[model samples]
Target chain A: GAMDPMQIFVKTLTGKTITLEVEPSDTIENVKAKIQDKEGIPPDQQRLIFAGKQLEDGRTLSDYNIQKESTLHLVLRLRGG
Target chain B: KIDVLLTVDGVNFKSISLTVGEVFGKILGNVFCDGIDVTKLKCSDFYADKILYQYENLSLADISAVQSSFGFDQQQLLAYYNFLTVCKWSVVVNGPFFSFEQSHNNSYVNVACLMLQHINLKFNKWQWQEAWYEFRAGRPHRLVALVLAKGHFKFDEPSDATDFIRVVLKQADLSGAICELELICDCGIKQESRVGVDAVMHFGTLAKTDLFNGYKIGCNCAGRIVHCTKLNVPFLICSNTPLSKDLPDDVVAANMFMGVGVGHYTHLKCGSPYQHYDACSVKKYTGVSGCLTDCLYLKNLTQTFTSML
Candidate 1:
């Protein structure tokens, strides 16, 4: 039932069309910054959809068992259309 | 590696060092093309402030300094961060001037090419600005772009072309969204105003659910000076996939009539043949399952959103 932050991160992006690469030593902020830099979207614009619930800002990925070598998705948000 | 926290325009961001050349290639590869090579995204002519625009060169110190200059902190220059664009205007006069009724005819199509170029330029500027702002602000700008449309548009259709050239010059001065810019006035343009209305209304709904929240446009048309912020109905984070019947009717309605505008420049102004299908009209056609349940929410929040400049 338990998982490492790195593991969770890797599992999230695995084989999905979206790709996120994070090193084990990478901090939560580093992962976020990478996503920000890559997406050309502002920080407030990113709505990371993981595990059915939306994630809140300020919480570290490591807290969600995301750690080094983790691949997570950085998905865009759409409403209506 | 020391964690670098970047705070700009009252917004916070983070930076990491992962071999500038390697990381930048990866980022640029994704940027230029999905799963494409990084070398393809390189812009040989692009550089700023002695810093070249490359992924590897995206260091903590360099990025932090760039971020600081954006409208982030209290001391930030909001105008400077606006990424302004310029437009040129020229109107041809044939003796006693042309009549309003005949003017709408495409007789002056060749004469008004300048105005058409101006509108396309405005759209292109927004597209470029959003791209740049995304690389900088990322989250806030990204969210808007995701929901917002791209590319610069002149007139909505080719037939509306003549009317646009005349009304724009006559009524609105051919106004289009560019960064903070100077007004372009000409002889025939009796009044000029620039208004950028960002809206969000559910389909088949008579009202907007979200309040407009952005910079105020300045105008002095018909001897009246006015400034107002654009409004949008409540926004929802769409799933990107096509909406299923199970999805909320309101959400589908909102997206169905996602892009609608009003006013004299738009087709919805009163007395105009196309005026009946304005933003509200489009929403009403979207269906009753839709409800603009949150207009007042944004209204309350933006109550103090006032400015003097």
Candidate 2:
């Protein structure tokens, strides 16, 4: 049986903080998609940071040592000059 | 009947009429004629037919002041100004050239080869001539662009223009130069939507390489990205792709004033999108006009990508 969903908090550049529920097996890309659905930011444009480490695609939240109630910072990818 | 003909570089193009009020006539009398009362002078002097005056030297601001002071409309004034402005940059390709004469040949490579050969001979740098032609092929459309670098004018001879063009191409930023290219050419580059992005890439000289990364493929009304129903050519669709409601009033005004509806995106294949957008309004109450407005998005993206680098 899958374990209970883990709770995570995300703070976006717009200063809005959101709570997300996920599983230990959820990949970083999945989390980004969820955040995008909620905030309208695309996956490519999103930069996620957790405990000072930038999250990379294909890695799981558990792989990053993300725990329940963990906080993530969201910043937009810098585009042009 | 008043006869006002609009001329550009001394060639007649269009003609329109205007109501020259008493105040406007007097001001013209002051500027063109001596202190003699304008009423006494022949109407032909005020009519602009008798005098061989150059409109290029006339300051629009000063003429606009006359329009305001006299409460008269300079209908042809703005039209004439616009005509001159458009015809300002007339580049004549100096050649007993084969490309212009041989355009009937449908072979894209032959056309490009002929142009390159012509450019190679005209501009003296034979050693670096091959470097100028090193562009990725398979672009959906072929475009012939004449991009003159900002300081290209400061240099002399075709020898220097070659070096300048090479350096500009290598730098990958064209924000500083004037891009004078045609939307359609005889080259194999098809006249389809692919030309939008491929056009910029085809030239391989523009600074904004992250050209088509942001815009999502779909209709603007669907909140996906901007898609044009009318145009067959591809274009860069969005600035920020922000909601039409989120855009500032001035931005909306700029788009509306240009008569180009804002929310619509062009065919993404062309790399040519509009610079501004019109906001949704009452009366029309449509979700968005979605009209692709101006091609300045190419320049805007050039500015954006140049900064990103």
Candidate 3:
């Protein structure tokens, strides 16, 4: 299904939340890249999750059924890699 | 014999006997005679803190009242209420008014104590004890306070505010001048404020007992006051809301010190408290101290509100 760009919230574990515009077709890796470009967070250190599922880097928003105004939880990737 | 514990040079002796009907100074002279050897010390003319002399003609009745007035000693009264030192612009106060007059509301021993209490509620960066030391060091100070009125009554009206201001200046015995104040009644404005000379009172969250709400209301106001005036002053909350610690600012409404375990003794709500009490004395309606907040919190009211900018 074709869809337009929409706003999604990235909420960190520390309780900071930031909004981003994203296309439903964007991959999880690109979403991490967007966070890096906007918030200075390194994509390699970003661990994104939605509805109890860890977002795999290659998957599209549509594949995960992420919706407009949806919230994605962010937990920082630890130092051990 | 009315047995009494004694102190001379601040050393407490065994409980001693008390006698009545002598002009109490004579009794004190003897008490000191026992505490120190004036002859052996070879001291010539020396003087004691005149505060002790204030009991000059103190009768047995008044002595009983003074004894009852505190949880402990007079030095403790001086210690706990150290605010007595800073609020006055100078030491022209020939000691405290010592009026102990209940008719004029309750002329308290402190304005600084009141202001110091709620300061942390809004002013984060301020280290007031630091401010106090700076002032005590004879650094330049620029404090000013105003009296807040409660209602349409003449005493609480604007003219009365000026009159009360006069009284504070007169009482403070200031070479210059310094600070005014009031607390949340969570009540009246329309009935109290006239179209002219009226200004804002509450900061943010009109209904929040917490006053600041999410706003961090005191953050800027206190700093701006320090910058604007650079003075030391008093804080007086004339209202004595019945204690509800669960309520916002809890005894901020009471302005009393709340020590845990022993309950209201430290808080000692405005008035006489060996039994039940008030702030200064919590009667149903005592506008006597209505002139109070006007004098004490005036400077802080300035600080607690907004930056001159």
Fnat of all models, as shown: 0.00, 0.00, 0.00
Give the per-residue lDDT digits (tens) of candidate 3, residues B1-309. 344444322222345454433333445542223212222222222322211212223455544443443222343323222222222323111121111112222222223222232332221112223333333333312111111111111211112222222222222323222221222212210111111011212211212222222122111112111111122233322221122322232223222323221212112222232111232332342322211121113323323333223
lDDT of 2 at B194: 25
Ranked by DockQ from best down, the candidates are: 1, 2, 3
Candidate 2 lDDT over residue span B192-243, tens digit each: 2222222222211111222322222211122222111122221222222122
Model 3 stretches with alpha carbons more than 4 Å out: A1-3, B1-309
The sequence of per-residue lDDT tens digits that candidate 1 reaches over residues B1-309 is 222222221233444333323443443332221112234343322211112122223455645644443212211222222211111112333221211112222212222221222121222233233433432331222211111111111212222222223222222211332111121222111111222211111111122221112211111222111122332222211222212223232222111112222101111111122111221122113232221211111222122223324
On residues A1-81, what C-alpha lDDT tens digit does candidate 3 reach at each position? 435889888877555777888999999998999999988988856767552235668989987677676667676522100
Against the native complex, each candidate's DockQ, computed on alpha carbons, is: 0.02, 0.01, 0.01
TM-score of each: 0.25, 0.23, 0.21
Candidate 2 contains a number of clashing pairs equal to 20
Error of 3 at B144 (Å): 73
Instruction: Please list the C-alpha lDDT of all candidates, in the order they appear.
Output: 0.27, 0.33, 0.34
On TM-score, the leading prediction is: 1
